[PDB]
Structures are given as C-alpha cells and as structure tokens.
Ligand binder design. Structure first.
Ligand code: NAG
Lengths: 97, 191
C-alpha cells in the first residue's frame, strides 16, 4: 500500500520479528505530532529492502516530472499523532529483525 | 553472445553517462593503467536519495553510502608526467551516511602505461533482496580493443546488504591531466 511501495518494501520469504510497544506519552501530543512524515510519492515503486529519502518532487503514479509540472507535490505527508485518538493514530515504535 | 555496449575512452572521448542498472550489469574493465576506478549506485543522482560509492582510491577499496551531492562529472585527476593522483573530486556534500567500509591500505598502479591492455576485471552487480551481490572475475589479457571471446568463472567477494535505491549508476573514470585528458581504456555495460 503506502509503506511497502513508497517508504520501505519488505520481501515475502525471509524476515524476522516486529518489536512494537506503547509510545503514547513519548511521541504524541493531544493537538498533533506534525514532526515526522512518510513517503507517498515516487516515480515507480521500490524493490524489497530498499531505503528512499529523496527530497525530489515526484508524481504519485510514476510520471516523469520536471517541476513545475502536472501532479508534482511534496514527497512527504503528515502523521498527526494524538493522545486523544484511537489506536490507529497512536504512535508505536517498531524494531524489525 | 549478446549485444554489449562498448564505451571506449580516447584522449577526446570522455564517457560516463547515466547508465541503467535495470536488472544488474556485467561489468568489464579492459585496463592497463587502472583508468576505471569507481561507481556511484543510486537513483536520483543528487544528495536527496541514498546512494552508495564503491571506489578504489589507489590506497583502499572505499565503500560508502550517504546522501552524496553527486558531482555531475565524477573523476580522479592524475598528473601524466608525474604519475601520482592529485584530486578526489567525487562528492560535494555527504550526509545521513548509512554504510561505511574502507579496505586495507596498499598502493596500486597509478601512472599511465602504454601498449596493450594488461588485465581484464570482470564485475557483476546484482540487487536482490536488499543485498548487492558483487562478483569478481580477473585474468590477464593482451589486446587493443574489441572485447575478446573468453571463458572464466565469476566469484563472490561481496554479498552486501546495502538496502538503497539503485536504478541507475555512473562510472568513475580517471582523468590523466598532463586541463583534463584521458588515456586508452574501455568499459562495458553488459545487461
Ligand atoms: C548484436 O549482436 C549480433 C551477434 O551477437 C550482431 O549480429 C548484431 O549486429 C549486434 N547488434 C548491433 C546493433 O550491432
């Protein structure tokens, strides 16, 4: 969806563990954690086990962009963590083996 | 017997463009004075995405992945009458350095030789499962140009999980400045 093809792709045969715990009081604030972001924007998609921290404006479905062009935005999008939200917008911290 | 792109370098011909890595490459180094000395494997070719530098600076095999500000002409400058390297103009900036390796200390052939090409280095680079499969082939040759028909086994030296975005790459030549200039050399893409 979002994490694999844009942020970081994982292969589907060899992988270790997911080490996630409760960081409600650590990473979030009740009005918003606007500090950390994700990629939804890449010309193309990733291979498995691949970082991408490109601060180059791309297209969301792989279209070649020399900006200012059509469908060319920020590579990064907000998280918005609350302490007054559900579990789906609580911040956790995952350690991958 | 498949089609192999021959990027020769003569005193005017200075070629290391954006070459696609799309499946991996079969590299050949038809060398006599170690002209080809490095690569940068990346996608965006700037300081934005992660990209790895694998070079031999005639002292070390320097293996490093950062946000290198990609100089749009990466080169080594070696004085042709003197015979030593003067410059290492590869990177301008380097940040979020995610991998580092520097090999053992030595001294390599730096100055320019003449005649046939002394040795052929056969390199294979593969991005699978985040690894960078780096293979090596090496046996001596004696030829002017036109990559010879041969038979030798490539051997594993570096199973490297770099985990970065590699869709393109770019060769790192060596400019022999006697003002830039080169000597006779050739490298091969080899999809
Ligand atoms: C590709 O290789 C074949 C034989 O290996 C050759 O006949 C053909 O001319 C080559 N292609 C080009 C464009 O030279």
């Amino acid at each position: 969806g979002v994490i694999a093809d844009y942020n970081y792709k994982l292969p589907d045969d060899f992988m270790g563990c997911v080490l996630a715990w409760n960081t409600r009081n650590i990473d979030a604030t009740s009005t918003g954690n606007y500090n950390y972001k994700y990629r939804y924007l890449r010309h193309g998609k990733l291979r498995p086990f691949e970082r991408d921290i490109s601060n180059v404006p791309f297209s969301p479905d792989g279209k070649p962009c020399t900006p200012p062009a059509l469908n060319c935005y920020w590579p990064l999008n907000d998280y918005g963590f609350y302490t007054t939200t559900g579990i789906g917008y609580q911040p956790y911290r995952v350690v991958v083996l | 017997y498949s089609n192999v792109t021959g990027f020769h370098t003569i005193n005017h011909t200075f070629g290391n463009p954006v070459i696609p890595f799309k499946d991996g490459i079969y590299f050949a180094a038809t060398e006599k004075s170690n002209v080809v000395r490095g690569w940068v494997f990346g996608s965006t070719m700037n300081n934005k995405s992660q990209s790895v530098i694998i070079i031999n600076n005639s002292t070390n095999v320097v293996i490093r992945a950062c946000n290198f500000e990609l100089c749009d002409n990466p080169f080594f400058a070696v004085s042709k009458p003197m015979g030593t390297q003067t410059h290492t103009m590869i990177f301008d900036n380097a940040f979020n350095c995610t991998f580092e390796y520097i090999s053992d200390a030595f001294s390599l052939d730096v100055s320019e030789k003449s005649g046939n090409f002394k040795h052929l280095r056969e390199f294979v680079f593969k991005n699978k499962d985040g690894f960078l499969y780096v293979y090596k082939g090496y046996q001596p040759i004696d030829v002017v140009r036109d990559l010879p028909s041969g038979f030798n086994t490539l051997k594993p030296i570096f199973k490297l999980p770099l985990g970065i975005n590699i869709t393109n790459f770019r060769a790192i030549l060596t400019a022999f400045s006697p003002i830039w200039g080169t000597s006779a050399a050739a490298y091969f893409v080899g999809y």
